[PDB]
Each structure stands twice: as C-alpha cells, then as structure tokens.
Design a protein around this ligand. Structure first.
Ligand SMILES: Cc1ccsc1-c1cc(-c2ccccc2)c(-c2nnn[nH]2)c(N(C)C(C)C)n1
Length: 133
C-alpha cells in the first residue's frame, strides 16, 4: 500500500518557472521551447515492490521502473543519461538524478486531489501541478 495515493493517471495542468529550471539544468533552447509546451500524462503504478512511472506526451515518452532506495539508470525527457535514486520521505517521493557531477531533485507529493511536482536545480525551483486524467 506504500504509494496507493500516487497510483493513477495524472494530466499536467500548470507549470511555473519550468523554463528557468531547465536553463539551470543545462537544457538547450529548442528542447526548452518544445518541452515547455507539452501537457504530459504521468501514469503511476505499483506491482509488488516495483513502482513504474510513465510519462506520455507529444514531445517525449519516458518510463522508469524502480525499487525504493535502489539506484537505476534513467534516460530523461531531455536526453540526459543519469543515475537516479527514488525514496519515500514522509510520504513524498523524492527522486534524485545524478549526471556529470551535477544533481537535481524532483519531489512528487499528493496535495488535495492533485499531484504536485517540485523540481529543484541549485537555487531554482519549478512547480508542476497534475490533476486526475
Ligand atoms: C526537460 C527536463 C529537465 C529536468 S527535468 C525535466 C523533465 C521534463 C519532463 C517532460 C516530459 C514530457 C514532456 C515534457 C516535459 C518531465 C515530465 N514528465 N512527466 N511530466 N513532466 C519531468 N518530470 C520529472 C516531471 C515529473 C517534473 N522532467
């Protein structure tokens, strides 16, 4: 039952400060512009200890499956090849991506009927809000 309230299909409804977050990460102009338009569906499921998070969109589709606390390889929407670890901390999924000596943290939280996603790179934060699809 670890992630019960995350399971489902979630559609992006709002994005704040995502262009500046992407800039801080190192994403180039064309990817920022096209990625910033998309309204992805984030599909979260659990089978045993394995959590799967898929994002489907116009831009790119992504898929990760993982066990909490166990590092894995990820290819991000912007084509970074990262080493990721996802944990549950106080009921928040905390996703850390490491690559080229850098790090970014993505938190997925249930708040009311929404899924709120906070992305942090150095001093820049972006907030993305998703509704049930
Ligand atoms: C470009 C970039 C740089 C650092 S992170 C990142 C990024 C990009 C996307 C995305 C996926 C498809 C279409 C458009 C953008 C998503 C995403 N996946 N699902 N929804 N947005 C995402 N997330 C982890 C989300 C959960 C915040 N992070």
């Amino acid at each position: 039952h670890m992630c019960d309230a995350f399971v489902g299909t979630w559609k992006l409804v709002s994005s704040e400060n995502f262009d500046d977050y992407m800039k801080e990460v190192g994403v180039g102009f064309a990817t920022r512009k096209v990625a910033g338009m998309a309204k992805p569906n984030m599909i979260i499921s659990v089978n045993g200890d394995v959590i799967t998070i898929k994002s489907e969109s116009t831009f790119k589709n992504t898929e990760i499956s993982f066990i909490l606390g166990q590092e894995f390889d990820e290819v991000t929407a912007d084509d970074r090849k990262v080493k990721s670890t996802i944990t549950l901390d106080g009921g928040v999924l905390v996703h850390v991506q490491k690559w080229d000596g850098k790090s970014t943290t993505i938190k997925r939280k249930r708040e009311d009927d929404k899924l709120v996603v906070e992305c942090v790179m150095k001093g820049v934060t972006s907030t993305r809000v998703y509704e049930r699809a």
